[PDB]
């Protein structure tokens, strides 16, 4: 149950709440007060999903689905079977997620490292809250949220997109996509660099950060460096999710028409608005 070097790290301390009460492991798992919090909220949420499974009439995981209260209820409570279960579960999810983040922070203090991980996780929690909480609220009903099932949740993606025509045209969505494609490109590159230095041609010796920098300069004329590529990964990633939240919080609230038409501002600048020719005149 212990990595050969683990023992010296398992010392008392770091907990944010509870003092020494929950300061222990169970197997490899650190527990903590928030360890307990997340189990509570997770179990609970799970039960409610199961329950929700009976009212629906399935145990099939590819069909089970928990829907938000219908629009008619606006931002109010709703009977279990018609969207109250989704409402509670969502409280439960948030409970689980946030609890996990703080459990992370506690693992951080015990080990004497920085807080960068829980912090990055918070951007994820924020994407979720945008879709299930903030958008709904500025919009006037839980009904705009998305439902909890494998496929139904995809349908919401598809319908909600097509409600504005081809969602490709949401400008914040283009940025966000950019960062996703870019973050993926950087990930392939970093993984490939470190390994090719660590695993060089049969018989040669381990290469060095220097070769890494060389390789890149040779190829594209620049190299960001070992600390920078880690700074960049963190950034591309968090930026993508940031733009995702953004592209959604504006859709349906300040822009409700087709995304394609939004580009008319550009096309209707007085400087070219009438000039004959091209594609748009």
């Amino acid at each position: 149950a212990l990595l050969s070097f683990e023992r010296k790290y398992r010392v008392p301390g770091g907990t944010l709440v509870g003092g020494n009460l929950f300061d222990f492991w169970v197997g490899p798992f650190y527990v903590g007060f928030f360890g307990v919090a997340t189990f509570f909220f997770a179990a609970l949420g799970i039960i409610l999903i199961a329950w929700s499974a009976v009212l629906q009439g399935t145990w099939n995981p590819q069909l089970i689905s928990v829907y938000p209260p219908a629009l008619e209820y606006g931002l109010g409570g709703a009977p279990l079977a018609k969207g109250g279960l989704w409402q509670i579960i969502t409280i439960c999810a948030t409970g689980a997620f946030v609890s996990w983040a703080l459990r992370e922070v506690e693992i951080c203090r015990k080990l004497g490292i920085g807080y960068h991980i829980p912090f990055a996780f918070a951007f994820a929690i924020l994407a979720y809250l945008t879709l299930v909480l903030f958008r709904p609220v500025m919009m006037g009903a839980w009904g705009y949220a998305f439902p909890y099932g494998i496929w139904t949740h995809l349908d919401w993606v598809s319908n909600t997109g097509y409600t504005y025509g081809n969602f490709h045209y949401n400008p914040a969505h283009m940025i966000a996509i950019s960062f996703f494609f870019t973050n993926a490109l950087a990930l392939a590159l970093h993984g490939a660099l470190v390994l090719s230095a660590a695993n060089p041609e049969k018989g040669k010796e381990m290469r060095t950060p220097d070769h890494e920098d060389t390789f890149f300069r040779d190829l594209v004329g620049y190299s960001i460096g070992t600390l920078g590529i880690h700074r960049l990964g963190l950034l591309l990633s968090l930026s993508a999710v940031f733009f995702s939240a953004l592209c959604m919080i504006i859709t349906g609230t300040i822009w409700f028409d087709q995304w394609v038409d939004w580009w008319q501002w550009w096309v209707k600048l007085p400087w070219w608005a009438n000039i004959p020719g091209g594609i748009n005149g």
Partner: peptide
């Protein structure tokens, strides 16, 4: 490749 095999709080193999 590191840290394994697992051990018990005393050093013996798990």
């Amino acid at each position: 490749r590191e840290g394994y095999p697992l051990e018990n709080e005393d050093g013996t193999p798990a």
